[PDB]
Design an enzyme around this catalytic site. Structure first.
Site, PDB file in Angstrom:
ATOM      1  CG  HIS A  41      -0.639   0.309   2.641  1.00 44.29           C
ATOM      2  ND1 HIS A  41      -0.021   1.372   2.833  1.00 44.29           N
ATOM      3  CD2 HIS A  41      -0.694  -0.639   3.652  1.00 44.29           C
ATOM      4  CE1 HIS A  41       0.301   1.278   4.227  1.00 44.29           C
ATOM      5  NE2 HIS A  41      -0.044  -0.041   4.677  1.00 44.29           N
ATOM      6  N   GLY A 136       1.686   5.465  10.495  1.00 44.17           N
ATOM      7  CA  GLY A 136       3.471   5.482  10.218  1.00 44.17           C
ATOM      8  C   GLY A 136       3.893   4.205  10.515  1.00 44.17           C
ATOM      9  CB  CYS A 138       2.019   0.708   7.445  1.00 45.32           C
ATOM     10  SG  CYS A 138       0.597   1.428   7.979  1.00 45.32           S
TER      11      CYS A 138
END
Ligand SMILES: CC(=O)Nc1ccc(N(Cc2cccc(Cl)c2)C(=O)Cc2cncc3ccccc23)cn1
Ligand SMILES: CC(=O)Nc1ccc(N(Cc2cccc(Cl)c2)C(=O)Cc2cncc3ccccc23)cn1
Ligand SMILES: [Cl-]
EC number: 3.4.19.12
Lengths: 298, 300
Positions: A41, A136, A138
């Site tokens: 993503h 943040g 991820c």
């Protein structure tokens, strides 16, 4: 003495955390050898179509104060693999493992490729993790350590509307029925990891807490009929076998601890606590309890 | 979202753990620069446990009596000195993995991460609070002596604890990195008992603000209280008194949630009076006191 939720020493993993920036999005990447793994993503999203439009210079990989030059990019399920010109000199002995529900792992929460905290999680039976993550995070990874080998088992991708977290193994396959798209997603009703509760009761007996122990034993079927009714996962013969060493060490047969658990569910704690907790803890596996009550080092 | 007991990443500390052997005793040492810090009781014999004279035992020691092992490499001890209850072993090699560090003495209520080691090898990392009675509720087996407590503030490791002993109740006692014990404890086998422990009230309030931030509001009420009235109720439940410093420290969380400190205090008063009623706060059925105000703000 003492029992604590204990994470694996995160050092071997910290030496792999990098920051991955693609346009305006910045998340964490796992730098192993000459490859950086991160959630795809970072790039209704057609990821295959978005990735072919990307070039190597679109990705900015930063390992500390050194920018790594990306020399290739490929996608494996929901994980992006960014080939870099430099192999990570801090790459530990590692392997990618897919864990099962009930299994525990340490999470190294990162922001901007910088490790900020370490905590011990369990893969819930509904395939979510009850983590603590802000935007943040991820790309933060879940791992176990076996001897001197880091087993990477999780990469953080998202937060569900209930505050629980969802992610993939290091091959990009999601844990659970989740997708990495902005769509209505809900975790299934969670259940208690019965084998981990029993392991934690053995840890309490090892620490001197015996009030919950009773004279009774039960059949595995009778226990599963009661436990199923309280939203507890069924206990299999594999679980009974895995609890064998703790049963031998404490003198409490597994079906003996099951009858103590059977009473704990139908009656409660009666104002008492086990290992300082008023609820039955299910995020310690049988192996976790043995490791902590025996001093296994990494 | 979510709230977890979270330890600092232990990497910077793992690169400092060494094994220190003196005769038959083997414990852990903290290797910073060309100095290895460890509990001074590593020099103790079976006869010198109840009433050891450490100054006298150390003068009888030579550098070749200490075996320092950092991984598969033996470090040469070139000097030894004692600072309170810690032994400082000078070595002929500076630790190339020495992080930016400082020695800090913490106060009760403060939290830190513990890197539990055995034979100079890190085995686990957990989160702790210095209890009001100056003990830690750790998870330590024999051989964990020398395991260190630390916090990290941007690149820099604050060493605040070194594990020395386990009290008869299963709680742990130790020193700062200057060898000064936390609490009324001594590093002798003499009869020692921790004082009755109390709840870190400011940390419970900080944790209730974390629960509000995470969407938990069921324990909130329309009441406020005076600080004195709250302290009178709190002590009856073995909770530490809340000082004006604690109220001031909870100011940012009060501003972020819109709930004044004295309003949250009345919520805590009610929780102590009724209990949870089968409900949980942040997945816990008891009031958590091992998250400081600073921890809650950092994690949220
Ligand atoms: C650039 C940017 O803002 N990126 C961003 C923002 C939000 C997210 N989402 C939503 C999302 C939506 C469609 C698909 C997926 Cl897979 C993910 C996340 O879930 C990230 C996330 C993770 N853990 C804890 C969090 C706490 C607060 C907010 C976000 C969190 C992802 N990337
Ligand atoms: C050879 C050996 O058994 N050594 C040993 C034994 C016992 C001890 N003591 C007591 C003691 C006695 C004289 C002075 C001091 Cl400062 C301390 C300890 O408390 C060590 C210890 C530390 N943490 C967790 C533990 C869990 C179980 C048993 C021991 C633990 C020290 N060394
Ligand atoms: Cl086992």
């Amino acid at each position: 003495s003492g029992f604590r939720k204990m994470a694996f020493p995160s050092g071997k993993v910290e030496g792999c955390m990098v920051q991955v920036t693609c346009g305006t999005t910045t998340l964490n990447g796992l730098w192993l050898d000459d490859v950086v793994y991160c959630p795809r993503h970072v790039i209704n999203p057609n990821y295959e179509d978005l990735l072919i439009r990307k070039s190597n210079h679109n990705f900015l990989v930063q390992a500390g104060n050194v920018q790594l030059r990306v020399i290739g990019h490929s996608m494996q399920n929901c994980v992006l693999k960014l080939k870099v010109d430099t192999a990570n000199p801090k790459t530990p002995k590692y392997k990618f493992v897919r864990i099962q529900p009930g299994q525990t792992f340490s999470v190294l929460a990162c922001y901007n490729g910088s490790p900020s905290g370490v905590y011990q999680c369990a893969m819930r039976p509904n395939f979510t993790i009850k983590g603590s993550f802000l935007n943040g995070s991820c790309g933060s990874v879940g791992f176990n350590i076996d001897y001197d080998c880091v087993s990477f088992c999780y990469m953080h991708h998202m937060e569900l509307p209930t505050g629980v977290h969802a992610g993939t193994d290091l091959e990009g396959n999601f844990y659970g029925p989740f997708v990495d798209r902005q769509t209505a997603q809900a975790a299934g009703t969670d259940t208690t990891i019965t084998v981990n509760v029993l392991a934690w009761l053995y840890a309490a007996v090892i620490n001197g807490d015996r009030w919950f122990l009773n004279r009774f034993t039960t059949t595995l079927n009778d226990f599963n009929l009661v436990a199923m009714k309280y939203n507890y996962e069924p206990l299999t013969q594999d679980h009974v076998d895995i609890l064998g060493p703790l049963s031998a060490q404490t003198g409490i047969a597994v079906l003996d601890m099951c009858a103590s658990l059977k009473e704990l569910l139908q009656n409660g704690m009666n104002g008492r606590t086990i290992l300082g907790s008023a609820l039955l803890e299910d995020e310690f596996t049988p192996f976790d309890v043995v490791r902590q009550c025996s001093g296994v080092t990494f």
